């Protein structure tokens, strides 16, 4: 079955010439097969015989397809694939089940062999030349060249999709009520028609595909739901998490632990509650992938507690365009967020989790923002719209923060949902000096070379202190300076510094950092009642 669609013009990479490879010496059997095989597609029109006017060649092989003692072939286009031009990206993006709509019935039509159905570019064919070996290398070489898309060739996938995309455009317009997801050599067709009516349309489309030479399996060979889709198992009315099985075992190797955390982490998305903290600790210092590790009981408790979470599978439902989208977010740990997108409460579409490492110096609100942003995007990619958000943050809070942050930020129409823990600002710097408050003139500096330093302060109330630091850097000095001022201060303080780093860091009301010291300061700040922080030029000899 050969296709009548127009061929895609193909060209070799800028200034390169076709493959000039050899044709491995074969056994009487291997040659016997190929000859028969070729003669088969030869009559089919798949390949044709080419004269000596073709100086190209690609190595051909013969392998007995496992399960069948019958001979099968294979052509090595590696060389060709290198010399071939680039095409557009074949995978725009993965269709996520949560994006699928609910259908009464659906059937998948595996096309597969269709490759050999799509005609190759008339002019490019010559480069697809290959030769058959004579048992003892008598005299000639029974040459052929590909006359259609070749298995394993670079272009095949790319070009097949297109063709497939075209051969479907007409049908796509006619039966809008019908859905068809294109994906590799699979054709996913779902609808809301009554089963019989559906089977009909299937055949209709099926014949349509056949109208262009595309051979597909009939009803009696079509695969039926539920469908094994990347991690998910989906039925016409719902999708389900293909329950995860954790191999219970004696000894554990490093490698094993990795793969475990792999699986485990992937599941964190769906089963929030999964933990790997202890499990991850086992890697520390690992010398070999095949090294075995003594699973700590803490890791035992955790690993077990997981096997339970991964017990109760959880189903989910599909997208209903008529319904608006609702995304809700919860704060799990520090910089650990969970969200779910549902159209009807408890009836989830998707759920994920995010873990934003300490980064540098960030805060919860910012983070939240980053999540909303991330989620927003997923949404535009899956459903084309952005969900209304239900956020654990007081409108007053959000307002106070964004109107005063230096960077442009924003959250789409969202609504406060009183579901603790709520995100809040852990402190705020006074806008002006605190009247009747001690004033600390903190300074810090360290010898970049020796890493020796002093940090200290003096106040309007005559108090003072200084400290010499070993193995430090200038910036840790400036911060330390401030830490002291915060320690020895008391509920209310005015702190002037000449440090720009700090003024920066803190003024950005961060509530978490990579730097322990900052964390220290931060804690100290939350503790205070009122803190005013001022900056002044350094080496200007001020106060």
Ligand X SMILES: O=C1Nc2ccc(Cl)cc2[C@@](C#CC2CC2)(C(F)(F)F)O1
- Structure tokens, 464: 């003072």
Indicate whether 460 belongs to the interface with its own copies (CB under 8 A): yes
Are the C-beta atoms of residues 293 and 282 closer than 8 Å to each other? yes
Sole residue written with tokens 């190209």: 56
CB atoms within 10 A of CB 288: 9
Which of 84, 89, 80, 88 lies closest to 11 in space, CA to CA?
Answer: 84
Told to check if 60 binds ligand X by CB under 6 A, we report no
Separation in Å, CA 188 to CA 103, 108, 109, 182, 408: 12, 4, 6, 7, 43
How far apart (Å, rounded) are the C-alpha atoms in residues 242 and 230?
Answer: 10
CA distance 356 to 487: 29
Q: Does 383 bind its own copies (CB under 8 A)?
A: yes
Has 250 been labeled as part of a binding site?
A: no
Identify what 541 binds: its own copies, ligand X, none; CB under 5 to 8 Å per kind.
its own copies
State the DSSP string of 89-157.
-S-S-PPPGGGPBP-SEEEEEE-GGGGGGSBPPTTTGGGGEEEEPPTT--S--EEEEESBPPTT-SHHH
478 marked as part of a ligand binding site: yes
The residue from 22, 65, 101, 223 that contacts ligand X (CB under 6 A) is: 101
Q: Return the range that interacts with ligand X (CB under 6 A); candidates 69-77, 98-106, 321-329, 533-541.
A: 98-106
> Which one of the spans 66-74, 187-195, 342-350, 476-484 is the region binding ligand X (CB under 6 A)?
187-195
Site string for its own copies, 319-338 (x = CB under 8 A): -----------xx-xx----
Using CB under 6 A, which of 87, 183, 402, 426 touches ligand X?
183
Give the span between the Cα atoms of 35 and 154, in whole angstroms. 25
Q: Contact 513/358 with Cβ under 8 angstroms?
A: yes
The C-alpha atoms of residue 502 and residue 181 are separated, in whole angstroms, by 54
Measured from the CB atom, the residue of 91 and 322 that comes closer to its own copies is 91
Which residues contact residue 9 at a Cβ distance below 8 angstroms, ignoring those fewer than 6 apart?
121, 123
β-bridge pairing 60-63 and 252-253? unpaired
> Using CB under 6 A, which of 61, 181, 416, 427 touches ligand X?
181
Q: Kindly tell me which of 114 and 368 has the beta carbon lying closer to its own copies.
A: 368
Binding site partner of 189, from ligand X, its own copies, none, Cβ cut-off 5-8 A by kind:
ligand X
Residue 71 near ligand X by CB under 6 A: no
Q: 495 with 418: CB under 8 angstroms?
A: no
If contact means CB under 5 to 8 A according to the sort of partner, which of its own copies, ligand X, none does residue 421 touch?
its own copies
Q: Name which of residues 91 to 110 contact its own copies (CB under 8 A).
A: 91-96, 99-100
Residues 303-322 that bind ligand X (CB under 6 A): 318
- Our CA angle for 88, 91, 97, nearest 5°, is 155
100 binds ligand X (CB under 6 A): yes
Residue 184 interacts with, from ligand X, its own copies, none (CB under 5-8 Å by kind): none
110 is in an annotated binding site: yes
236 touches ligand X (CB under 6 A): yes
Task: Select 342 or 472, whichever has its Cβ closest to its own copies.
Answer: 342
For its own copies, the binding residue among 291, 292, 315, 429 (CB under 8 A) is 291
How many residues at the interface with ligand X, by CB under 6 A? 19
Interface segment toward its own copies; rule CB under 8 A; list 72-80, 225-233, 234-242, 456-464? 456-464
Q: Is 188 among the residues that bind ligand X (CB under 6 A)?
A: yes
Q: How far is 502 from 483, CA to CA, in rounded Å?
A: 11
135 lines the binding site for its own copies (CB under 8 A): yes
Using rule CB under 8 A, residue 308 touches its own copies: no
Interface with its own copies, residue 9, by CB under 8 A: yes
409-428 residues near its own copies, rule: CB under 8 A: 409-410, 418-422, 424
Residue 264 or residue 522: which is nearer to its own copies going by CB?
A: 264
Query: Which residue carries 């408790």 as its tokens?
Result: 301
Of 231-239, 366-374, 384-392, 450-458, the window that binds ligand X (rule: CB under 6 A) is 231-239
**CA-CA distances (angstroms) from residue 384 to 321, 387, 424?**
10, 10, 31
234 binds, among ligand X, its own copies, none (CB under 5 to 8 A by kind): ligand X
**Residue of 3, 7, 54, 103 that binds ligand X (CB under 6 A):** 103
Partner in contact with 199, chosen from its own copies, ligand X, none, beta carbon below 5 to 8 Å by kind? none
Q: Pick from its own copies, ligand X, none: which does 298 bind, CB < 5 to 8 A by kind?
A: none
Residues in the chain: 543
Residue 24 vs 194, nearer CB to its own copies: 24
Q: What are phi and psi of 386, to 5 degrees?
A: -110, 135
Taking alpha carbons only, the member of 357, 405, 331, 361 closest to residue 520 is 361
Give dist(CA 492, CA 532) in Å, integer. Answer: 8
Q: Cite the annotated binding site for Mg(2+) by residue number.
A: 110, 185-186, 443, 478, 498
Interacting residue ranges for ligand X, rule: CB under 6 A: 95, 100-101, 103, 106, 179-181, 183, 188-190, 225, 227, 229, 234-236, 318
């Amino acid at each position: 079955p050969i296709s009548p669609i127009e061929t895609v013009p193909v060209k070799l990479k800028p200034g390169m010439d076709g493959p000039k490879v050899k044709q491995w010496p074969l056994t009487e059997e291997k040659i016997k097969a190929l000859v028969e095989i070729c003669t088969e597609m030869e009559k089919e029109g798949k390949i044709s015989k080419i004269g000596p006017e073709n100086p190209y060649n690609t190595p051909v092989f013969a392998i007995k397809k496992k399960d069948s003692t019958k001979w099968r072939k294979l052509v090595d286009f590696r060389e060709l694939n290198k010399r071939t031009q680039d095409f557009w990206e074949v995978q725009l993006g993965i269709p996520h089940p949560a994006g699928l709509k609910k259908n009464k019935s659906v059937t998948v039509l595996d096309v597969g062999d269709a490759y050999f159905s799509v005609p190759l570019d008339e002019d490019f064919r010559k480069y697809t030349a290959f030769t058959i070996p004579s048992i003892n290398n008598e005299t000639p070489g029974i040459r052929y060249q590909y006359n259609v898309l070749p298995q394993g060739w670079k272009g095949s996938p790319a070009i097949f999709q297109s063709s497939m995309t075209k051969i479907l455009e007409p049908f796509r317009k006619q039966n809008p009520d019908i859905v068809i997801y294109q994906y590799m050599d699979d054709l996913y067709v779902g609808s809301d028609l009554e089963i019989g009516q559906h089977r009909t349309k299937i055949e209709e489309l099926r014949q349509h595909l056949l109208r262009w030479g595309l051979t597909t399996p009939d009803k009696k060979h079509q695969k039926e739901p539920p469908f094994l889709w990347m991690g998910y198992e989906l039925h016409p009315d719902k999708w389900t998490v293909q329950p995860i099985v954790l191999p219970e075992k004696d000894s554990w190797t490093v490698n094993d632990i990795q793969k475990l955390v792999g699986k485990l982490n992937w599941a964190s998305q769906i089963y929030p509650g999964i933990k790997v903290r202890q499990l991850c600790k086992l890697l520390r210092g690992t010398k070999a992938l095949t090294e075995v590790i003594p699973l700590t009981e803490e890791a035992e408790l955790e690993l077990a507690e997981n096997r339970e979470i991964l017990k109760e599978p959880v189903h989910g439902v599909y997208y209903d365009p008529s319904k608006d989208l609702i995304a809700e977010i919860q704060k799990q740990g520090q910089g650990q967020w969970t969200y779910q997108i549902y159209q009807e409460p408890f009836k989830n579409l998707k759920t994920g989790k995010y873990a934003r490492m300490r980064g540098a110096h960030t805060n919860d609100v910012k983070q939240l923002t980053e999540a909303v942003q991330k989620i927003t995007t997923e949404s535009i990619v899956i459903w084309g719209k952005t969900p209304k958000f239900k956020l654990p943050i007081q409108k007053e809070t959000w307002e106070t923060w964004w109107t005063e942050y230096w960077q442009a930020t924003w959250i789409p129409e969202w609504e406060f949902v009183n579901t603790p823990p709520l995100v809040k600002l852990w402190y705020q710097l006074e806008k002006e000096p605190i009247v009747g408050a001690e004033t600390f003139y903190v300074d810090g500096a360290a010898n970049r070379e020796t890493k020796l330093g002093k940090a200290g302060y003096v106040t309007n109330r005559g108090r003072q202190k200084v400290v010499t630091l070993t193995d430090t850097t200038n910036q840790k000095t400036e911060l330390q300076a401030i830490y002291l001022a915060l320690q020895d201060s008391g509920l209310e303080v005015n702190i002037v510094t000449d440090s720009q780093y700090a003024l920066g860091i803190i003024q950005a009301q961060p509530d978490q950092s990579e730097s322990e010291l900052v964390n220290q300061i931060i804690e100290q700040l939350i503790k205070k009642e009122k803190v005013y922080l001022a900056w002044v030029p350094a080496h200007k000899g001020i106060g």
